[PDB]
Amino acid sequence: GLFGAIAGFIEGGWTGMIDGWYGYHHQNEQGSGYAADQKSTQNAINGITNKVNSVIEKMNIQFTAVGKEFNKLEKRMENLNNKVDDGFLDIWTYNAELLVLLENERTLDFHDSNVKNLYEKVKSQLKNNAKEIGNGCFEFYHKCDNECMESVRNGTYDYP
Amino acid sequence: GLFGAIAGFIEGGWTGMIDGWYGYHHQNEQGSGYAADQKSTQNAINGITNKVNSVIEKMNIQFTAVGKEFNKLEKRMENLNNKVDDGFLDIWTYNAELLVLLENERTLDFHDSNVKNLYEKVKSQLKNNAKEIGNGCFEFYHKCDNECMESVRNGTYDYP
Amino acid sequence: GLFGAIAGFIEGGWTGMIDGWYGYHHQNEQGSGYAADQKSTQNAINGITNKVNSVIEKMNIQFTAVGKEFNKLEKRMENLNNKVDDGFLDIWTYNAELLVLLENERTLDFHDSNVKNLYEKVKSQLKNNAKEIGNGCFEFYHKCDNECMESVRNGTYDYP
Amino acid sequence: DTICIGYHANNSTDTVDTVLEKNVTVTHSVNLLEDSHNGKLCRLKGIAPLQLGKCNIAGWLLGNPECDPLLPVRSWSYIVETPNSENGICYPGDFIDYEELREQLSSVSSFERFEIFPKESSWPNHNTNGVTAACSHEGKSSFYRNLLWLTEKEGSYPKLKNSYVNKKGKEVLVLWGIHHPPNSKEQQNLYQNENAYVSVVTSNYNRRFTPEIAERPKVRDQAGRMNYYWTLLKPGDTIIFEANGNLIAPMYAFALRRGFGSGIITSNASMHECNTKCQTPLGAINSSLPYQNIHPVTIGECPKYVRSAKLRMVTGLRNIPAR
Amino acid sequence: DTICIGYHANNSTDTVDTVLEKNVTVTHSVNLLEDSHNGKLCRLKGIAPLQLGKCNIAGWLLGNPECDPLLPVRSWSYIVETPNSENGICYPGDFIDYEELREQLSSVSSFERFEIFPKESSWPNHNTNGVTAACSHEGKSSFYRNLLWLTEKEGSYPKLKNSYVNKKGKEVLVLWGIHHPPNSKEQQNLYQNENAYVSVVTSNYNRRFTPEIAERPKVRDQAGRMNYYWTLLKPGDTIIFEANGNLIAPMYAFALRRGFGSGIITSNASMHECNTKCQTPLGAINSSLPYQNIHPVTIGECPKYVRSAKLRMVTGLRNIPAR
Amino acid sequence: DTICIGYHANNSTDTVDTVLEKNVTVTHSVNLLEDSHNGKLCRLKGIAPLQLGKCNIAGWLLGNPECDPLLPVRSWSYIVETPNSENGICYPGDFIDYEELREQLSSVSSFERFEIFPKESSWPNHNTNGVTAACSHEGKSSFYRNLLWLTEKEGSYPKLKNSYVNKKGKEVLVLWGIHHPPNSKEQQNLYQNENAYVSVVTSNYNRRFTPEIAERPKVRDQAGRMNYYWTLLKPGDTIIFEANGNLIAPMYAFALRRGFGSGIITSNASMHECNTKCQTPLGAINSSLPYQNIHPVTIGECPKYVRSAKLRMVTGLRNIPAR
């Protein structure tokens, strides 16, 4: 990963999450459970949705394109027509394949970045009230409620 | 942002800083005020300037291009010419629009990255001589003048 | 650099390194020295090698392309042929030059990123068993063996 | 009490290519390449195409006896020829500017076939039963449905001159032919005059035709030849035919209506009662995807043809089930 | 004592699009799309264009009486036709290879109109006052200024042969016509010879013309027709005209000088005393921007035309005043 | 004790450009732009090209006496003309559809030159020794090797009618000419018949030629003219020549074999005993790089031509020796 998070200091994903792409897990006495961070997952959705729609939109509709006939004494013209169709086809095939290859890389790195930033947003929130354990996880020192685990998932959380 | 600084752990910008893109605000019992980081701002200016110039330079001037006439028995040649002109027009419109959309994204990330690294630059200097507070800000432990604030700006300040 | 490592907090490269692109230096009493990280360097080689092969693969071979003659009364056809050849040539020259410029940028950031991630990978292990000094460097608080400096390289070393 | 920060994962096996790595399994992705089509030729926005079948544009427009089933068709959304469209010209000869004529029909949405020169009343002093075994129908010598073979009458071929003023309010496609006997005896026998000529003129068309007599290799068992010509008579204009032999006169002409989006395609697929917005020679397409790798020939509103085998855009992320 | 790290912000309302997000307000950006123009036709590098006005290339080169104001113009930077350029050929007929001639003139930077065959001494044995109502001037029957209608003199039209050796050191564009009477009656009292011909030859040009007489619909009240032809006479070569009727002889010819960057455009904009490096049919452009969405037709050194309505690159950062 | 994390550096001076910075020194890089070749003309996959030398396609196919060295060549990989390929037609005239003939030859991999009409037994009643100073060899008047100038014999020029059935199982290219005397006296002395004509027909070709007599500027000291024509006789078809004058008859024809990848190029480079997969007019290329800036004209499998002066992709990183 470009930002070190995904497939990085956070070895794998959670098949247990089904509310989004990014989220959390808690180890309280009231129980455990996964929860997606709507904020970051939504932004990620609006952006990727915009990316796919931009790619689709730039490729406006292809109107009627047909072949043409040339008599036996029009071989040069027939070959010019051939050079034109093949030349454009080469360019469009090239553009499409490159655009997809390049954006996919950009997209994967995008997610990696979101996870990294989400992790940091939490780390800077908790500060000294917890330690960084198995990468991605945090062990609270004061132990805190479910209503408090929420304060963490929502950016609030009050105490150093 | 891809790097988490702009519109990230540094909520907003300073309409008060007019000497550059990235900088510092100071708070002393000598006074307050803003100061742009020439080093960073300039390097970002060189980069963006070369980028825009590259985009412009790659589109070397369009020389004389006009329409062509065809008699009533040259419909196929007329349509061929039409296909050629439309085809090239579609490709350049596509190329121009795509190139701008993709580079604009990269440019914004560029700035984000610049703010992140400048921050990490200062953080690593004020190692243990202050603490991280309102994100982007640092509260000194020993209280330091105006000259010392400058030692932070020009990358010096060599205190454990 | 985009990630701040190369030419960043790690001012320069090591001419002494001749095993890979990213590595470490020994500073204990059993002698100094350099050691390249096979994991990182290799993964980086797989990616960059794939990138170059993609660029090359996308540009299939140009088959026979030759000029054409036109009689004195086929000036419009001759100019059309000319517009087609120049048109395609402009696009491919533009494509080739843009792709290389943009990917070169990406490649350099990729390395910057790999140095950053490897730096953080180490900085997350040592943790308290040493401090960060000359940027990229860590002074072991407990002082350890050559065999030990190896624990760090092979990603082991799990001490608080 | 521990809170962890993580990312989604699932059982998806979707794969996409990136610049640094190929076949990367991801959680969610979207296909941008349409590879599925109907077979089947369909109506285009409710309008059926013209299926020439065993006939080609030439056989259709000249009225080759084996294309009669096409005589009534008046409108279409596109034209379809098949690999078996062999029935075109039936009497050997050259069809001048045939390719351009095809291009013209490519923007025609419909027309009315009408009698420009009625068989009975237009040629009082000439025979019109001229028929040939090269253009047979039901095993009997016949002739083009839209043309008339004019020949000598009672040992005489009076210089003829016929006009037709276009009052259709549209361009009228007129076709005709010039017959070339293989020898002087035939020329004399069929047209009386040895040095005949044909003249066809309008406000913007002016051509003269001279018989070129010589022995030639037999084609469809004919040493003779017939050259075919055509013009577009503008609204309100007049066309004048003048000749003293060799004229294969127009009997039916076509009042043309222009449209957009049509074209001529070659296909061996079958016509069914389906409707589409996008047709290719292999089958119809119903899709919103930006690209397609089905066929470069398209009628209507279609995705852009590309040679790509796969174009998939990753939306989700690297999928690491961590099983 | 506190020290913060922050970024610039302002009141800029500039917006740009990106792959992930549209209309993003930024502090600094640059427009790369030129959309402003003069609304006028200008001089190109100090040289004015040839404004044919109510005339077209044909009217200009043949010398249509209605195009006399153009007769003296010798050089130009580009040629401008207008939607109302109707005055071309005044006597009905076909202008052979007209489009190609237009293409030739497209690379001509200037020429000298000169008498190739002085009216006074070139045709001692033929009348040269032939005139027509189809080419009237000042409500009076007239004729092309660059051609001469030769007719029978004193009941006779002797076979003529005239030559011209190109010593201008430049290609010489020669134009001429072939008249086609509507009936042999007229053919004979204009040219005497019922069976006439015209021959025009040079070292690389060789063509013969035969009158084709026939009743034709009246165009510009003429049942007759006049076809026009041209050829380029290489430096030093000789062109020979020979005929016994129907020749519409050349009187003036043009010694051509070739240049680069010219062309023919159609515009309804007016000529003003302005100078530009880039001209379009809508107006002149003065810009250094890479793209323009003004018009696809351009003369000079212009920005590349694209269909885009907007192309703006962000230079500054995301604008967050946080007011 | 200390452990540092760092990156590789070296003495490399390679530079590459990026979007943000130009000439960035890197450690490892790869060139993608091929700029080398051997200024030689080579065999293409073992097969040598046809070098026309001082001759051009016209000279070669008509059999211009100055192109005898080419007579035996039966196959090639590509065709090569030089800036000094002047020897085309030697007797002035027009080579009809010459450009299309060149296009036809560009896909011919080989042919067999054979006698379609043996000189000794084809024209029993006509003289075949016709010769001209315009087509001289060894300082003596001669004629095209593949054509025969037929003229009157014993004050007579009988109407000739010869045929040839294509039993070669391949397309046969037939070439011929029509001579045009400058005056009737010459027409009479050479062909006897004042109103001669030539006719050429096949199953799909049909043209008649009429001598057009007129005084003309001398080219290669000839006021006369000779026009050349050609056609492709389909396998099994028959071609018939019929004439009573002016025919420059076919003697040798060409049974053609089609291939792929061939073409005509213009070069002043010399042929050498080298082999290549990619040939350009400047020299041969042996490379695997995606692009080349050597020449746009290519024969074989070559890198894509681009106007770039440099295309270097960085693989290693920013080089900082820190000395």
Ligand SMILES: CC(=O)N[C@@H]1[C@@H](O)[C@H](O)[C@@H](CO)O[C@H]1O
């Ligand atoms: C974003 C959201 O779900 N809203 C809750 C809010 O109602 C609650 O008061 C606060 C502290 O518990 O945490 C937020 O997450």
Ligand SMILES: CC(=O)N[C@@H]1[C@@H](O)[C@H](O)[C@@H](CO)O[C@H]1O
């Ligand atoms: C679509 C295509 O490849 N064309 C073939 C066609 O050549 C063949 O005559 C026909 C026989 O049914 O089958 C079609 O599929």
Ligand SMILES: CC(=O)N[C@@H]1[C@@H](O)[C@H](O)[C@@H](CO)O[C@H]1O
């Ligand atoms: C200003 C600039 O960056 N361009 C120079 C170029 O003029 C020079 O030819 C090349 C090699 O010496 O080095 C580049 O850096």
